[PDB]
Design a protein around this nucleic acid. Sequence first.
RNA 1: CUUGAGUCUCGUAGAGGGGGGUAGAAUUCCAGGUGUAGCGGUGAAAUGCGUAGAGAUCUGGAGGAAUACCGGUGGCGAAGGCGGCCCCCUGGACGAAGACUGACGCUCAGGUGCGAAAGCGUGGGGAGCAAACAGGAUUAGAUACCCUGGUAGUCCACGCCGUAAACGAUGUCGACUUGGAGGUUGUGCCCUUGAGGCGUGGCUUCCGGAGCUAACGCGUUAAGUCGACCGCCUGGGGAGUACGGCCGCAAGGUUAAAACUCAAAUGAAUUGACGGGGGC
Lengths: 88, 52, 65, 106, 117
Amino acid sequence: SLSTEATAKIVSEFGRDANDTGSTEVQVALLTAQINHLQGHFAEHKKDHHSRRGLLRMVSQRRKLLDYLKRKDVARYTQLIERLGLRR
Amino acid sequence: EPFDVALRRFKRSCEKAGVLAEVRRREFYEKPTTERKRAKASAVKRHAKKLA
Amino acid sequence: FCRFTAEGVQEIDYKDIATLKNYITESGKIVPSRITGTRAKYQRQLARAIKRARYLSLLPYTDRH
Amino acid sequence: MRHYEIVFMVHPDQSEQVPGMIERYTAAITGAEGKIHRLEDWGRRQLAYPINKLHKAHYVLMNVEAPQEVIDELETTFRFNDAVIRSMVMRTKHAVTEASPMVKAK
Amino acid sequence: RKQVSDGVAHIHASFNNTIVTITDRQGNALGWATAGGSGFRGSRKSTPFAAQVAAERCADAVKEYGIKNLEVMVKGPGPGRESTIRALNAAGFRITNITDVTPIPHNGCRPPKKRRV
RNA sequence: CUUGAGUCUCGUAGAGGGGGGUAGAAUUCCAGGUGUAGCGGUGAAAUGCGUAGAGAUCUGGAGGAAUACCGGUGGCGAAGGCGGCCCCCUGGACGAAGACUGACGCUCAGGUGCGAAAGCGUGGGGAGCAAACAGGAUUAGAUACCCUGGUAGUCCACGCCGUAAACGAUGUCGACUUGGAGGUUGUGCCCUUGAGGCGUGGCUUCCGGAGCUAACGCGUUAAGUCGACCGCCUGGGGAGUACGGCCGCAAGGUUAAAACUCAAAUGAAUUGACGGGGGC
Ligand SMILES: [Mg+2]
Ligand SMILES: [Mg+2]
Ligand SMILES: [Mg+2]
Ligand SMILES: [Mg+2]
Ligand SMILES: [Mg+2]
Ligand SMILES: [Mg+2]
Ligand SMILES: [Mg+2]
Ligand SMILES: [Mg+2]
Ligand SMILES: [Mg+2]
Ligand SMILES: [Mg+2]
Ligand SMILES: [Mg+2]
Ligand SMILES: [Mg+2]
Ligand SMILES: [Mg+2]
Ligand SMILES: [Mg+2]
Ligand SMILES: [Mg+2]
Ligand SMILES: [Mg+2]
Ligand SMILES: [Mg+2]
Ligand SMILES: [Mg+2]
Ligand SMILES: [Mg+2]
Ligand SMILES: [Mg+2]
Ligand SMILES: [Mg+2]
Ligand SMILES: [Mg+2]
């Protein structure tokens, strides 16, 4: 749902290289942007369960990738969840 | 113009537009499950007809 | 049959009443695809265009009004 | 930006006012720097069914790219007007400049 | 007892009964007769014969209006739909054309429930 | 490490969802324009409306609900489910050719969410339909089917309920195993291209092979050959009942026995008989 501009900006920020798009930081940052954006949608559409299912799929992928990135290295995990303010 | 074969021209548009059948169909309420069951019956029949 | 593939026209226009009229009966009812030969992908766009034109009063709903 | 095709009718009696009406509709797009790819005036056309017991309504076609808020404001402006009797806004995937089928038929 | 110089026949039909009504193009009733007012009641009321009687009965009951050219609008799927047409074409009724005016709802209201028998 | 899983770029199809507008057909009611005796109803009737003008017919208005055909053997959704048109916010699937991450995966007790219809609470809304109910019939009876009415309900908003033959009576993920005819949906190639003929995918319908099955049947969308995990079954009644716990405003749901009782209960198929089932 993110525009191409926002997606490429997030990729270029959290990417080791601009070309790098599948790294765990890029993916978790895209997930975070979408999860933060859908808050305004579900603040009004409280009856939109069929989209909240996709929102839940996103928070689940984010939780799994955060677990992976934590076990893989503490450094990247700590700095990434500090930049995104996750797990405060 | 003749009145007889001007009335057979009525019984062609009338029928091919169906409305006679539509009044019978909308005469009574068909429950949606019966609608779908009858659709499936007609489907399987006019399908497996043109194989055998 | 399937005219919208011989010509190859990607989009059907609700403003082209000359084409829409060939898919509407005198009663004003859309013709099925088992009669005209149109593809399903294009029959759906035909129905959409016909309804959009009937909203703009460019086509009758019924033969009476 | 989003391309929209707007085809609105208008009361035959107020047809003289229609060139004056187009100014505010064009101005809203111009103010937002929105583009206009296709303007066509079919003119009075015979209605297939009555609309408020009226016939021979005047049809106007506009193809317009603009911010969504400007289009929403134009839609509120449409309902307020009385001469107008039908407003249709249609989001198109591209901006079409090709001649209208009605204009070609003329 | 007065002219209107033209007429429009409106054949209302129901499974139970058939109604014939001559009216001016303006929709003002000039004469009317029902297949149930022809002396046919119950089952006898609903039959092409009863509607054929009611058509001519209404024709004569309006005849003093000197109607000649008429437009026939027939409604309802019951029998006597064409029988009535023919039986009013009698007495030199110059039929312009016919039209089916049966009311067809676009999935509008809930019909009554199916009968068991 | 890149084959599993996931990300990015480009597109495609869709009744996927939420919200807001809106149009046409029809029903009903209201006011009237003409007009006359029936209307409506059924096996046949009657109750029921009608001479204070019904019904029929034309004009104008009010209102609620549902979207003829298109429509499919169609599509989308995890399932329940989803159908006029337009806009707005929005989820997923798929394809093409690449780039990137590097096992990040599968399953899942408790847990949490969603979950047809009926029903419940509060506030609306109420055209049609219609439990209870009222009358008219049928009948030996008729607390029924039939008929005229008709209330909650159906509709909306926010809560609850958590149940269905919620079914493909078939848990989820993965690999492997002869074929045929289709539908729907992308896409590579090549004809000179329009049509057209080859390749490769996604989903889906119907035949049928091996195999499997008690049989019926299933059959590359397995009920075949296997692996991972979870749920569940242990004769028929008693009983999905009791008691207790948890949950619910309530209806109730969920978890879930025993005593006793019987020697069967059951599945599929077969041969007849029978049918107010057909065809000759
Ligand atoms: Mg995505
Ligand atoms: Mg009835
Ligand atoms: Mg939709
Ligand atoms: Mg009156
Ligand atoms: Mg599907
Ligand atoms: Mg569980
Ligand atoms: Mg309910
Ligand atoms: Mg309630
Ligand atoms: Mg209430
Ligand atoms: Mg009843
Ligand atoms: Mg009723
Ligand atoms: Mg109650
Ligand atoms: Mg179901
Ligand atoms: Mg089960
Ligand atoms: Mg499998
Ligand atoms: Mg098979
Ligand atoms: Mg298996
Ligand atoms: Mg088995
Ligand atoms: Mg036991
Ligand atoms: Mg219990
Ligand atoms: Mg208890
Ligand atoms: Mg058996």
